[PDB]
Amino acid sequence: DYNLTEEQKAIKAKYPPVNRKYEYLDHTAAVQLHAWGDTLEEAFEQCAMAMFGYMTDTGTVEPLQTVEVETQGDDLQSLLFHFLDEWLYKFSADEFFIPREVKVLSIDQRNFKLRSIGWGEEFSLSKHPQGTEVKAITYSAMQVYNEENPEVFVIIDIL
Amino acid sequence: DYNLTEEQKAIKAKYPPVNRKYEYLDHTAAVQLHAWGDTLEEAFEQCAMAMFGYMTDTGTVEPLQTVEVETQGDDLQSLLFHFLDEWLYKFSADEFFIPREVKVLSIDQRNFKLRSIGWGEEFSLSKHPQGTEVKAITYSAMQVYNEENPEVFVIIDIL
Questions:
Q1: d(CA A139, CA A150)
Q2: I need a surface site. Which of A147, B21, B35, B101 has the fewest CB within 10 A?
Q3: Which of A20, A21, A23, A42 should one mutate to test binding to chain B, selecting the residue with the greatest count of B CBs within 10 A?
Q4: Range of B57's domain?
């Protein structure tokens, strides 16, 4: 499964081949997003911007369009999960939208309701740099530090 | 982060920059090894070969020297773990040996002891293709089947 130099190919043919009786399965990968802000709404919105920043350079997205994502949860952690998941879906399913920026307009901390919007356009390999695909959001070692200088830690599955 | 086209570059300058308050941490990865053989001795050697076959093309490794690895365990699963951890150690440090091929000469199923050998040479990106570094052996989902057509399943941490 490798690209070889003519030199390396020389080696291989020189020696008896080895019988292989094995295979590789279930390759998995993940990365932990850490985001922060002056408010809890800033930390979530930065978190969504981190996620998308791992899919491309958002600096190259034009804010042609606007999208709104509204969601809710049982607690802040679930709220963050859904918040990220809905956004991911907007990218994943047609329209395959990607925001240049996200802004969280409001978070209700009693009932765990959230309003956000993002501005950008249709994602395209011809137009926009390629980075890593994002497979899913995960509750793995998820933290919401709702306090002075809020911080958010989220693990996402990738390729 | 990304190297981009002038067209892409032009766009970035066209619009105001986005302030960023995030970072990416703890990039991780895993792959599962599935190896089999007619004997158990074979399953095990093949499992090691799979591990090494993820680091480079083991076919490009010349059998210049031979090395011995012996280990013990409390059970078969720990034996496997140590066996792979020992072969892994020998690549990661001191002489940085990679086997072209590995043979398990004996396993003691009563006392959980084994002797293996491998033939190969010092690792070097001057000779050998770059694959993935292997960080660690994991007991995660470790399975050893010691009936007819023995097989084993092991997960490893990778970079």
A1: 18
A2: A147
A3: A21
A4: 1-159
